[PDB]
Design an enzyme around this catalytic site. Sequence first.
Site, PDB file in Angstrom:
ATOM      1  N   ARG A   1       0.861  -1.214   0.000  1.00  0.00           N
ATOM      2  CA  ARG A   1       0.000   0.000   0.000  1.00  0.00           C
ATOM      3  C   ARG A   1       0.886   1.249   0.000  1.00  0.00           C
ATOM      4  NH1 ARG A   1      -2.169   2.863   4.392  1.00  0.00           N
ATOM      5  NH2 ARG A   1      -3.966   4.186   3.901  1.00  0.00           N
TER       6      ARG A   1
ATOM      7  N   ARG B   1      -5.668  17.615   7.344  1.00  0.00           N
ATOM      8  CA  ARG B   1      -4.427  17.224   8.066  1.00  0.00           C
ATOM      9  C   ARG B   1      -4.011  18.321   9.051  1.00  0.00           C
ATOM     10  NH1 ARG B   1      -2.446  11.912   8.007  1.00  0.00           N
ATOM     11  NH2 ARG B   1      -3.282  11.026   6.077  1.00  0.00           N
TER      12      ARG B   1
ATOM     13  N   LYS C   1     -13.295   2.993  -0.159  1.00  0.00           N
ATOM     14  CA  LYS C   1     -13.141   3.140   1.310  1.00  0.00           C
ATOM     15  C   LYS C   1     -14.381   3.850   1.866  1.00  0.00           C
ATOM     16  CE  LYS C   1      -8.977   4.505   2.711  1.00  0.00           C
ATOM     17  NZ  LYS C   1      -7.957   5.576   2.666  1.00  0.00           N
TER      18      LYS C   1
ATOM     19  N   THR D   1      -8.762  -1.343   9.694  1.00  0.00           N
ATOM     20  CA  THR D   1      -8.512  -1.050  11.130  1.00  0.00           C
ATOM     21  C   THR D   1      -7.051  -1.379  11.458  1.00  0.00           C
ATOM     22  OG1 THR D   1     -10.811  -1.493  11.667  1.00  0.00           O
ATOM     23  CG2 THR D   1      -9.265  -1.582  13.507  1.00  0.00           C
TER      24      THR D   1
END
Lengths: 500, 502, 502, 500
Positions: free
Chosen positions: B51, B93, B246, B304
């Site tokens: 990833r 962020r 997602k 998670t």
Amino acid sequence: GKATCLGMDKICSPLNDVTQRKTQIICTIGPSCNNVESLIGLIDKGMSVARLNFSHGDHESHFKTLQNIREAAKARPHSTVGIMLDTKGPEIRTGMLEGGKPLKAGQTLKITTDYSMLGNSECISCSYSLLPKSVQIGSTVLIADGSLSTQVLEIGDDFIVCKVLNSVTIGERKNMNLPGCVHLPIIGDKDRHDIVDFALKYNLDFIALSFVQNGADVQLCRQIISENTQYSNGIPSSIKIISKIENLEGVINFDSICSESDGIMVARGDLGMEIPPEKIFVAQKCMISKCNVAGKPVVTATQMLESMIKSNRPTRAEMTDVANAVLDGSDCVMLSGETANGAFPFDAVNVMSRVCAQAETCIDYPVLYHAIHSSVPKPVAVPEAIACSAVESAHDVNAKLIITITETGNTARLISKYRPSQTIIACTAKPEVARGLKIARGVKTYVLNSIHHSEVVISNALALAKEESLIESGDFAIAVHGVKESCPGSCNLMKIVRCP
Amino acid sequence: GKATCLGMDKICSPLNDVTQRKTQIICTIGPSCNNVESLIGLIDKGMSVARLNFSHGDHESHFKTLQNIREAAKARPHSTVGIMLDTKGPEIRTGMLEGGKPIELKAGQTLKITTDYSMLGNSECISCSYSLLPKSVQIGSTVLIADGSLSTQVLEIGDDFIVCKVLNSVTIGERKNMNLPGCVHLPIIGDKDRHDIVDFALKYNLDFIALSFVQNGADVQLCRQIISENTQYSNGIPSSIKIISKIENLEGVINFDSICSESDGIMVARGDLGMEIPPEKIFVAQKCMISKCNVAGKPVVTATQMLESMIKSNRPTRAEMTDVANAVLDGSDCVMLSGETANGAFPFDAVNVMSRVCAQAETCIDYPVLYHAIHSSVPKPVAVPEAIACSAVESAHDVNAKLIITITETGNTARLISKYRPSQTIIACTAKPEVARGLKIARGVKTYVLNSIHHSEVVISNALALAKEESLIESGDFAIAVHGVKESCPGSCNLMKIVRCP
Amino acid sequence: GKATCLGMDKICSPLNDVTQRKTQIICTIGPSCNNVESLIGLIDKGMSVARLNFSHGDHESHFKTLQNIREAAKARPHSTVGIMLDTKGPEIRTGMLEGGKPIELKAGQTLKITTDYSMLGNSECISCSYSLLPKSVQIGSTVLIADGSLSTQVLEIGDDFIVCKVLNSVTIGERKNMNLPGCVHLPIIGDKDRHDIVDFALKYNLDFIALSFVQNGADVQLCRQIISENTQYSNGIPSSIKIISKIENLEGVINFDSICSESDGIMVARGDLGMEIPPEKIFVAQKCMISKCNVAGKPVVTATQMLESMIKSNRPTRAEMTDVANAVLDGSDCVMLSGETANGAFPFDAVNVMSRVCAQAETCIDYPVLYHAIHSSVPKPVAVPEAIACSAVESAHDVNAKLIITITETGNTARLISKYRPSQTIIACTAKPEVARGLKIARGVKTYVLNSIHHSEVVISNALALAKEESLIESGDFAIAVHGVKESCPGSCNLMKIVRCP
Amino acid sequence: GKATCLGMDKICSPLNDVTQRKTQIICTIGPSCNNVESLIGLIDKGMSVARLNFSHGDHESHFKTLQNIREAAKARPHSTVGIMLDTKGPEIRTGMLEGGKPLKAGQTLKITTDYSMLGNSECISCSYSLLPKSVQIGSTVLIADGSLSTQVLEIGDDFIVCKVLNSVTIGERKNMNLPGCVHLPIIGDKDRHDIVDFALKYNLDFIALSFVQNGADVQLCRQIISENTQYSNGIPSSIKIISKIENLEGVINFDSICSESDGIMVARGDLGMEIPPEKIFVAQKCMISKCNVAGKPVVTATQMLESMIKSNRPTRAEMTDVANAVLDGSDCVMLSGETANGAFPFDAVNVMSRVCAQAETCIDYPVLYHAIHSSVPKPVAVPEAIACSAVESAHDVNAKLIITITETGNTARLISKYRPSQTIIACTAKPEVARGLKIARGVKTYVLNSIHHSEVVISNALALAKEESLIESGDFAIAVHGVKESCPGSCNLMKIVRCP
Ligand SMILES: Nc1ncnc2c1ncn2[C@@H]1O[C@H](COP(=O)(O)OP(=O)(O)O)[C@@H](O)[C@H]1O
Ligand SMILES: [Cl-]
Ligand SMILES: [Cl-]
Ligand SMILES: [Cl-]
Ligand SMILES: [Cl-]
Ligand SMILES: [K+]
Ligand SMILES: [K+]
Ligand SMILES: [K+]
Ligand SMILES: [K+]
Ligand SMILES: [Mg+2]
Ligand SMILES: [Mg+2]
Ligand SMILES: [Mg+2]
Ligand SMILES: [Mg+2]
């Protein structure tokens, strides 16, 4: 998953919101919630049972705490609180330190069997004098609920030396585990004394029997109860034996233990020792399943909200952990440090209650009923048939309550075994029958002066259940009781009534 | 539950774990495992997919890391590694702190948050990437930081800042994510994301786009349009790169059915579904979405972070292992390591632990119950491959086979077999590497990349030999082989062989 | 099938049939059993319902027979006998023969059929009741006679007759029924039928109208309109008489769902569904209609004459017994005797045989499979009585009760219990005789008629005592009791007691 | 019933109409269908197996009939016809009469053990010489498939006298039954001779073993076959033993018999004797069910179209009777008098075929498969796993055919056990394997010169199945065969092919 996705369909809507928790809650009583005002606090947040861990406290504080629980009990007549004595048993403890808390990974640590020795970050004490003669070299010795891992390097006459495997700064009369290895009796002199001269003497409801290893350990505890009738007029106490599975011996012998015991208590922290960490859930899920089939209440004694000892909020992980304990089929959950010596006992019990209530909505009830119904061989005893019809009728007409009038709590325990969505209300004249039911999933209790006029008991129960926001007018309830004469004869029956 | 108690009966005997993990593992690649030697380390401990979180890194480090993964891939020809681009998307962020070091926020304190990103923040004032922060918050609003670990309540709202009462004792680092009230005030696929998809994911022929903050089917349709329009780097044939949506907010949960249908897979993290869904309700959403995926036959990833303690420690907690086990039992195709691999002290140990726990939790699956559940969800009649897929899984169980082999040009039959969740490892034999990589989120699919698949007898021989050297099967054990015949079957056909490993 | 093989394990042991028949029995009343002494004979052998076929008899004999049934009823107070009027409807009949004697038609011969009903026919020429017979037939048409026992093909069509080639060696009597091609050229409920319903069925307070040749819901709605409009003989309250729709043609089968919904029950005969449905397809229709009824919870009667040999013989054939058994296993609530009772040599033996076979076939029913089948057909939530009904049947099985007792003013709960098909005999305790009689087509319902049902404890005591004297239960055996409480339950309620027979 | 009501929904529509019968048909060969032209007639109407009842005929007619069946067989190469020898066994027969047929209810009837005596309507003959010494007073003696009932009044030295209970006019070498009582062997001298010097000598396919009473009777018949290898080059014959349950002893010992036998034959007329008429269906339905689970073909040998001995049409009762025999789970039905000495053999077989085809549409197949699948313990042998996948795949993609290439018929018998909706085609090089499969529900057979080129066998089978109206172009078929080399290794596989 059907019920779980009906839960998610509600998460995505504007609407009221209706959940009532059935999973029972054990609160460990200690300094943080020892007074009468705190214990009333715990009752309101949803305490089912008060636990006295006799590994801690002294003769004086044990008696004082018992008086406080029972004073708190009188201040909430509509809530019934069970009282559990958790035996010291063959546990092993570290000795006391010089001042406060001491240990770095790689170091050596000496452990002496002279308990009357103030320990430091090189040498600590041990309550077990036969420690060197019950360990080989390379043996793992776990300390403080298995947080500190060590390996034994040397074995002396009256000592051992251990290579520390963890950087940690915790100490002071913490528990020690010796996996695979302990020449101590399950029920010792102190434990036989604590059972007879506290649990039986002051008429407690549960003995949580520590480190049970086979049926014979439970038979021994039952022998003590039947032999010591001095404090109960010569009738054996109906106190319930909850066997704690804390080692692999207990897991091996579970079927026997489970059969002999009135309930079972399992903690992830205890089984951590001899069973590899990545295998524990296998044992815990299986033992809970076996209990569900056997119709014996099972307690997940795991400390699951550890973060809430210091914080006012839990972690998302801890909530998922509790939810899974409930979905696994736990009758009962337990708070240890969170209530006993923590900063937020009320918040800890509150969180435990809310999560339990949510996880219970995700239970597919039909699947669970037909599973347990097909486990019992036919024909059955009348009460178990009445119990099934109660749960079936309740579901079929969407009742909110199942009411049982009982002298024993037999029918309540049977209904609880078939795991209904509805709260069970056990109406009884005998308080110890009411308290004894407080580990059984979904059983609230109403203690009355008489149960002789069934029509009035059900009227008063529906009225009280109305004031407890369990049911409203026009909602269905199942009522279940015996008739002694002119039924015709004696009988057991099931009424589908409407709350007025 | 009988499979769980057969597990407990083995715990109480002299024998010797005979178990192969089927749950796929995603490893987030970062500084802690960026080099070729570390990535080979992750492959050996059981990495299925690499990833690249494009919320982090720059143009240079992204390309360097891609070269390192593919060099590590060449050093292990028997292991196939998928590469996933995780989009920045409409995230918010925190800014940088004073020359590093993570600040220790104490419950009850105030915290100021400024809209000047070019400001080195401390334990009283930190920065924010989103310039419209004060104009998208009311007083008393909860603002979550660092995957919702730091909870704060807004006391004051200024021109270009806010002040917040901290509600947690917690230690947070630099450039962590912020969550705000609502159901995403930015575009799902922005300029950067359309650029990252076309000029990295498509340009360098990656296998997965992990599409951040997907909110409905239209978001996935948009991403598919970009892929079909931009064929410059794939000879004019649309890329077969897979879209993993997602679900990071309540909008996504509401619209799941649509999203799940449009997407090739689904990714859910407990940490993201923070806010608008109460913490004590999240497992309800996660368990339901995983179930829905299992029925739909779409691979679902539990994203998670479940071994957080292993960022600093050599060992996990017992709680963390139970958490992973339940993710697997809930029906996860795939688990994910984030900080544990990306910037942690023990990446290899983290992947190792994840693998062992997954292997154990898989033994507790009651397979018969699961097969008959999914088999009765599909309406008859079915397409030939799905019928072959079922017969493969049934035959495998009936004769106690250790392996299911599928020879495929597409990976269609492998994905179908994976949906019926057999106890046996699936080996997808293919000549197309991108078909092999594309299968690495599908539960239980190992892959064998060949130069040709023309001689079926030889492909199965070589696959059984390779599976033998990977300790998946031994001599005399049964295996199910599944492939098409192109001519003289008679005609074309699909068949299922019950063969014996030599 | 495990219940069938528990039956076979008993056939191979020293013990002693302990079996009580639940299938209800209809007896067609005629010359052979017309007197009070014969009807008492039929009650003792197990008659549930007395059938008056208004295709036969005259005004005088109909009334005389009704008096005889009700006199026979008074002579057996513990047995309740329902009375059914079977309508003539749009039937077609052969005329009279020469001073009696049944003619022997030989296969290949010609047979003339005239429209002059007042003509004494022979073995070459017979009569027909329908004047439009030649104008409703083509050449080559099949014309069936005597419940479709005699098949004939039409050679010639005259002005007021036809000539037919006989296709069967067969012996047919007087005034037998004829079937013609199509999907009924007459009204379903004519002048005679509206008269017979109002001035006999309603006038003398009968229990069942067996509505001949029902073709759709509208036919049943018409019959219900007649009942609701004509309240003169019932004080101005619509009669609770039950409509049993007879499916006698393909139109009825096509429209079954509608008919079944409108009707209180259904009646099917293999002999009627002759023509338009090929003989080798009839069982398909009969088994399906019976199944549909079982699900709908509507009592279904197999009206098929199944012991034909017993019109002349003292014993049946083994084939005839297997035929009855299969009718019961197919799910029949009720069986029917026609010629065997109405004009036969052994009415008592015929009813006796029917009873014994039914009792045996009932032991081969797998009850668990049947209950869970019907329980899962009803959507939840349900009305209280249906929940009480289920708990009664479950409890009964769980504790191995021999009896289910229901105290009822309507028979609602008895009909509901009957739908769940328990192994135990149901006893419907009621103060209203028409409620008791109305239940006599419902599988397994015996009835106890009282003067009051006010003291529940006494009703159950007296019911257990009566059930003891009927060999349904013994001392110490369990029984389920079910009734309402009107006050102080608290309020009104419905309950279920598990009691013990003293 | 779901499948039964989909059948009724088709009865109520204009539309094509598609049914292919899977239930096998046994035709009893006799005077009415003895010649080559009649036997070809029976094959075309759907004869699976030819039955020679060795209770009838002589040495000459048995041989003549065998030649005629095999000549008829050569005239239809695409139809495979099994040949069954039905043993005389310990049967008891009435003697011959003076001229023609004689008896009135209430009368007395004498029965002598002098067989060489021309009997009348007062005295008849009996083939069993120990008749008086194997009967008590009041004993019931049934004659002619239990049509004539009698009660024994008197017992002499070499006779009995019987009170007739029925008016009936039938006689001449009819069978006698003595319920509860017969000192004759199951396999006598004639039966051991008929098995060795006809069934084995002329290489027949089925021995229908009359009056089987336990496993030992079947073991004895297998011993005879293994001992007498003279006519098969020294290899034991693969002839199949079908045990006939004709008495209560057989029913008691069924499990054992069924296990030992290759199949089972049950007739309502035979069990009529010792088992009360109203109980027979209980026994018949149970034995058929047990066979279905065990995977052994069961024949309903009941004469079910008796009316068709004299008539060109059956009764509605008789059709319902056949349908129920099929729905009960019969692999196979049987014609006796209807073919052997009746006026309409072709019409009788035709009716039997059409009714069977209709009753098969009412079978709920899913329910039946999952029932039998869950009866077999796992793991299983490869062929049984291939058999299941064949039946599963066939249903899932709605195939019209299951093709199996076999040297033994093992996989065909296994597929037949899982009771698919599709016709099974057993492709084989061995004719006796083809004939041996003709009692197995739904198995057609194609006899080839080679089975070595699997692709060609399946091509030719699909082509032949096309010409037999079993499948059309574009329809799916399941193909099943072994591979001996380069599979890799040896294997068994299942192809989902398309008919060209
Ligand atoms: N009766 C008591 N008196 C004093 N302190 C107690 C008592 N019970 C519990 N505690 C404290 O609260 C903690 C709760 O943990 P618990 O599970 O009961 O004990 P343990 O530490 O032995 O596992 C104990 O560790 C101890 O510090
Ligand atoms: Cl309570
Ligand atoms: Cl791989
Ligand atoms: Cl009655
Ligand atoms: Cl054939
Ligand atoms: K303790
Ligand atoms: K991202
Ligand atoms: K009529
Ligand atoms: K014979
Ligand atoms: Mg503890
Ligand atoms: Mg993250
Ligand atoms: Mg009639
Ligand atoms: Mg015969």
